[PDB]
Amino acid sequence: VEKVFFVTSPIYYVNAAPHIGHVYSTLITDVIGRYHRVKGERVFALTGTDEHGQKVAEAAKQKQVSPYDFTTAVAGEFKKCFEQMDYSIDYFIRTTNEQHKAVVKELWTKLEQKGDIYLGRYEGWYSISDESFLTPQNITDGVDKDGNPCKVSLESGHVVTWVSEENYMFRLSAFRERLLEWYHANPGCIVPEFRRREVIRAVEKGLPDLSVSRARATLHNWAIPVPGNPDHCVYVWLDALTNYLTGSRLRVDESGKEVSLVDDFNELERFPADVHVIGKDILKFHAIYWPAFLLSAGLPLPKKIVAHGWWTKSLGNVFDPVEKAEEFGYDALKYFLLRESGFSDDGDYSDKNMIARLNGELADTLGNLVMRCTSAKINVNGEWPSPAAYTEEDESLIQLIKDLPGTADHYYLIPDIQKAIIAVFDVLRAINAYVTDMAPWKLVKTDPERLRTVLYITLEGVRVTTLLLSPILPRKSVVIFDMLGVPEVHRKGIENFEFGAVPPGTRLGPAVEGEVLFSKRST
Ligand code: MET
């Protein structure tokens, strides 16, 4: 069925300033959203801040400022960061928002009515920094700020404390069979695949019930009250995960402010998420807890959870994304982050490798090709020529260009943005090779008829590759299209994935004295 394509980032803890992890997660979310908008679909892309809980309230206390003031200020820092990064997110949600709290209370009440919440106790380990319950098998020995013997989390390395409280408990154990059914019936619902296998193994072993409330004193009263019991607060993660539901129900105006909360999610056609973008650090919450809550409430499950390789959320290793983007370019940094790494940590993020990709891929492969086909020396009439008859070599390149949208489409839908980029650049390399073989600079004098054909194919290859790279290079793609003289109507829509969508006779855009797309930088 036709619906609004709904893509989300995690909502980030506001204990600290925005950093590369947050920017990376929201970048992926943004790229996916952009691709679906270029495809001509309706899109709602969501990001925001996770503002309640012990961790935030303790950070507020450290800075000697109220939780209200602290969260509002740090949220403002996140908004500013994402504006500076030139994202195109449709809404920024904050869990302190009154409409979100109403949704949390609805969902809580639904779970309780279904018989899935009971009053019990949690006695066990807890990482405040991850807001995560841990079993004894997931802890080990380590050290704290004092350098004194303490327990730490195996998953994250943060300090764990023993908790013994009477707590509202969600009957997670009862959802094991249904979760396993879901994973097996939808074998692309978690990506990448090895992370799907991890989740399945964990659920097969068995699920304990889950504490979904805490004593109010423990959280410094900085959380959502349990409906019908003011002494208890809603677990920060049930609160947090519900943001996706709240977002799916907010009507938003032209300026991006929330103006209304609808009763029925179906009214806005967003829920459930088509893609939840997350870091590997929060996989269990999204692939186990979240769907169990939705199953309890009788709500539809998300289509895909994609978990990337970075562990999101003084030592002398600073990476400021705004600083690096001011140095190397915003689109270039975005390209680098999405190209350098797939679902690993193992990528190299040095200035050396950044420069190597800028120079070799963006400047030498893409930019060079754009200048060649728009150059006055080669394109003497400053237009899209009408092609003459095609050779076999012409047809081999044309075939690559025609196959590219379908290939790139599949990669974007996985989603696997690294492979989408690689596929496009494989075609760009082939076009370059073709240009080198045809030597159009010699044809200008020798064989003008032949040049028409070569020039046309080259222009069309640059257009199609650029269209498919426009989610990755949103600003530079616009520059490229302006140079090519591609009318606005042809810059989006699946109709324009087709070879030959821009007619011969189309005039190129004006030139500038010494304009460069991507300036190469010192080795
Ligand atoms: C429902 S997404 C919550 C993510 C969490 N606040 C984090 O920063 O890891």
Task: For each of the domains in the chain, give its residue range(s) and CATH number, in order of start.
Answer: 1-115+237-349 (3.40.50.620), 116-236 (2.170.220.10), 350-523 (1.10.730.10)
Of 143, 363, 100, whose CA–CA distance to 239 is shortest? 100
- In what helix (H) or strand (E) does residue 103 lie, and over which residues does it extend? helix 98-113
Q: How far is the CA of 9 from the centre of ligand 1 (A)?
A: 9
Give the integer Cα–Cα distance in Å for 218 and 58: 11
Is 69 exposed, middle or buried, given 0-12, 13-18 or 19+ CB atoms closer than 10 A? exposed
Query: Are 455 and 381 in contact, with CB atoms under 8 Å apart?
Result: no
Structure tokens at 449: 């008829």
The answer to whether residues 320 and 24 touch, using CB atoms and an 8 Å cutoff, is no
Which of 350, 415, 310 lies closest to 30 in space, CA to CA? 415
Question: Nearest residue CA, atom 8 of ligand 1?
Answer: 12
379-384 long-range contacts, CB within 8 A, separation 24+: 379/455, 379/508, 380/444, 382/507, 382/508, 383/485, 383/504, 383/505, 383/506, 383/507, 383/508, 384/456, 384/459, 384/485, 384/502, 384/503, 384/504, 384/505, 384/506, 384/508
The SS3 of residue 136 is: helix
Number of other CB atoms surrounding residue 311 within 10 Å: 14
8 A C-beta contact, residue 18 and residue 42:
no
Ligand 1 atom index nearest CA of 285: 1
Closest to 404 in 3D by CA, of 341, 479, 461: 461
Tokens found for residue 186: 């939808």
Asked whether the bond before 471 is cis by omega within 30 degrees of 0, the reply is no
Residue type, 30: D
Resolution of this model in Å is: 2.3
Q: Which residues contact 284 (CB under 8 A, 6 or more apart)?
A: 132, 199, 202
Q: Which residues of 325-360 are buried (b: 16+ CB within 10 A; e: fewer)?
A: beebbbbbbbbbbbbbbbbeeebeeeeeebbebbbe
Q: Which residues are near ligand 1 (CB < 6 Å)? A: 10-13, 50, 240-241, 243, 282, 312-313
Q: With the C-alpha atoms ordered 383, 388, 393, 399, is the resulting torsion angle positive or negative?
A: positive
**Of the candidates 467, 458, 456, the residue with the CA atom closest to the CA atom of residue 433:** 458
Distances (CA, A) of 131 to 55, 211, 251, 276: 8, 11, 30, 20
Tokens 């006055």: give the residue: 376
Angle in degrees, CA 309, 314, 317, rounded to 5: 45
Cβ within 8 Å of residue 67, ≥6 positions away: 56, 57, 60, 220, 222
Q: Concatenated DSSP letters for 428-445? A: HHHHHHHHHHH-HHHHHH
Distance 198 CA to ligand 1 centre (A): 20
Q: How far apart are CA 517 and CA 520, in angstroms?
A: 10
Cis peptide before 192 (omega within 30 of 0): yes
Burial class (CB in 10 A: 0-12, 13-18, 19+), 316: exposed
